[PDB]
């Protein structure tokens, strides 16, 4: 569902990389709204149909980067 998970995005450093995460999960189909700050380390996104798959990390990874939480609370 419209469901947007917003995190940290770790090993992020250069290249298209970044953005080039975005523009591959356009193709997941539970995508509703993708963003990534390639100098404050976030992104947000929406990325889940029926349901969250591991694609939601695996998208990151793609890029020689990793998923963290962004937090204090």
Same mark, same amino acid.
């Given at each position: 569902m419209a469901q947007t998970i917003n995190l940290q995005l770790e090993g992020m450093r250069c290249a298209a990389c970044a953005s080039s995460i975005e523009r591959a999960i356009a193709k %997941?189909?539970? %995508? =509703?709204?993708? =963003? %990534?700050?390639?100098?404050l380390e976030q992104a947000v996104v929406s990325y889940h149909g029926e349901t969250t798959p591991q694609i939601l990390t695996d998208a990151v990874e793609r890029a020689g980067y990793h998923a963290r939480v962004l937090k204090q609370q």
């Open positions: %997941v189909p539970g %995508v =509703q709204s993708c =963003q %990534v700050n390639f100098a």
